C-alpha cells in the first residue's frame, strides 16, 4: 500500500536516477573528448 509498495516505488525512482546519471556521464565523456582533440 503505502509502505512495502512505497519501497518498491522508491527503488524504481532511483533506478531512473541511475539511468539519468549514466546518460550525464556519457555527455561529460564526449565533452572531455572534444577538449582532448581540440
Amino acid at each position: 500500500d503505502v509502505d512495502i509498495e512505497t519501497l518498491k516505488q522508491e527503488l524504481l525512482e532511483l533506478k531512473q536516477r541511475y539511468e539519468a546519471q549514466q546518460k550525464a556521464l556519457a555527455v561529460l565523456e564526449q565533452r572531455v573528448r572534444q577538449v582532448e582533440d581540440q
Copy 2:
C-alpha cells in the same frame, strides 16, 4: 535474512550516494569547463 527495515535503510543509504554522485558529476563538469575556457 529478509529484514524489511534493513531494505528501507539500505535504500536510503543508496539515495545519499546518488546525491553525492550528482554533486561529483557537477564538480567534474566545472573542471571540464575550466579546460574548455582556458
Copy 3:
C-alpha cells in the same frame, strides 16, 4: 503485489551499478586531469 526477495535482489543490483559508476567517474576524472596538466 510486491515480491520482497525481488526488491532485495534489485537493490543489490543497483548497488553494483552505483559502484561501477563511481569507478567510471574516477576514470573520467583522470582523463580531465590529463587534459589539464598537459
